From a paper:
Here, we characterize a similar enzyme (ApeLiP) from a fungus of the order Agaricales (with ~13,000 described species), the soil-inhabiting mushroom Agrocybe pediades. X-ray crystallography revealed that ApeLiP is structurally related to Polyporales LiPs, with a conserved heme-pocket and a solvent-exposed tryptophan. Its biochemical characterization shows that ApeLiP can oxidize both phenolic and non-phenolic lignin model-compounds, as well as different dyes. Moreover, using stopped-flow rapid spectrophotometry and 2D-NMR, we demonstrate that ApeLiP can also act on real lignin. Characterization of a variant lacking the above tryptophan residue shows that this is the oxidation site for lignin and other high redox-potential substrates, and also plays a role in phenolic substrate oxidation.
Numbering used by the authors: 1 to 331
The structure:
């Protein structure tokens, strides 16, 4: 019900100002629409930003962009290690806009995630007011935290157990650079450029290795594949009685995870916010997956630990060379 300077059509004139910002992001941040490090980092940033929130107060203003506006404070916390890199890349591009910090952070994550084939078209609201103060320390879960502690933290923000697992489909387009300091950008699945369910499957393969210097760095546990990092907390969720059957649910069920991730993200990116305008039609529709998921080369069902023997895991093909090595996400 309107048409904007740059041409495109929308439901509200307020949404018209988002189209130049989306070009600035794709050019100057996402290396021309890639599902690379900066796309992944933008998603991570949105979570770290939004989880500075508690329904009972005292833990920050939520999805307010506090992590951008007050980064000198928040990027000094341990649990935010590596965030400073994202902030440094986002801050100059932010300044070429008149958005609030919250509206920028969460649009960058909506756009970046969509550069990943297989991801759901994410909702995007805007009109967030400026963040007031930095979140306090300790709002961001750490991979050594217990399952109990992590689910408790999420509850405070307003999320149930299942939603925590669906939110972790993010790790399908994700890597670690602060655990293995000599091995930056080590992915958590085989296909960090694709938002598929590979992640869920490769985390239940038997852990036999350690990547990089082959040593036990603190937040990681044994990985099934060379070049792949497995977080201690991801493996905890994958094996824990409370969550192991939820963990297997998405495998090769792309539509299942698309809806669950779309809905949990819709809530996450508005935590602590009220009174926003819907602008989801500015958000590009991400490409689809070129085909269903397959076992990595040299793996089969033989290699899985089923903590959910209540459900037959779905059959799937298995590319055949030798067991591969996954390179780091590019820079
Ligand atoms: C549930 C508890 C979670 C824990 C313990 C956790 C932990 C971690 C850790 C340790 C890293 C690697 C940091 C580094 O060393 O570079 C990471 C990366 C990442 N996290 Fe999670 N995370 C959690 C939940 C989430 C959620 C809810 C989202 C978003 C929906 C998310 C999105 C990401 C992304 C995209 C990355 C990759 C960043 C990049 O490659 O640049 N995480 N996470
Ligand atoms: Ca925040
Ligand atoms: Ca993936
Ligand atoms: Zn900085
Ligand atoms: Zn390591």
């Amino acid at each position: 019900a309107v048409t904007c300077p740059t041409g495109q059509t929308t439901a509200n004139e307020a949404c018209c100002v988002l189209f130049p910002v989306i070009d600035l992001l794709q050019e100057e941040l996402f290396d021309g629409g890639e599902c690379g490090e900066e796309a992944h980092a933008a998603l991570r940033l949105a979570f770290h930003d939004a989880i500075g929130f508690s329904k009972n107060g005292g833990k920050g203003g939520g999805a307010d962009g506090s992590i951008l506006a007050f980064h000198q404070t928040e990027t000094t916390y341990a649990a935010n290690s590596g965030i400073e890199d994202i902030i440094t890349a986002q801050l100059p591009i932010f300044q070429k806009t008149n958005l609030t910090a919250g509206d920028f952070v969460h649009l960058a994550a909506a756009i970046g995630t969509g550069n990943c084939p297989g991801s759901p078209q994410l909702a995007y609201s805007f009109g967030r007011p400026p963040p007031v103060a930095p979140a306090p320390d300790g709002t961001v879960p750490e991979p050594t935290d217990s399952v109990t502690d992590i689910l408790a933290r999420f509850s405070e923000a307003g999320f149930v157990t299942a939603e925590v697992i669906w939110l972790l489909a993010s790790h399908s387009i994700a890597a670690a650079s602060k655990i293995d300091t000599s091995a930056p950008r080590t992915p958590f699945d085989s296909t960090p450029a694709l938002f598929d369910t590979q992640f869920y499957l490769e985390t239940i393969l038997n852990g036999t290795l350690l990547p990089g210097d082959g040593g036990a760095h603190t937040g990681e546990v044994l990985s099934p594949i060379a070049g792949e990092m497995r977080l201690q907390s991801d493996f905890a969720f994958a094996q824990d009685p409370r969550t192991a059957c939820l963990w297997q649910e998405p495998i090769n069920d792309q539509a299942f995870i698309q809806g669950k991730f779309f809905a949990a993200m819709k809530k996450l990116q508005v935590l602590g916010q009220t009174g926003l305008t819907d602008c989801s039609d500015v958000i590009p529709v991400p490409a689809s997956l070129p085909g269903p998921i397959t076992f990595p080369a040299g793996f089969s069902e033989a290699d899985v630990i089923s903590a959910c023997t209540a459900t037959p895991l779905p059959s799937l093909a298995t590319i055949a060379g030798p067991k591969p090595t996954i390179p780091p996400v590019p820079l």
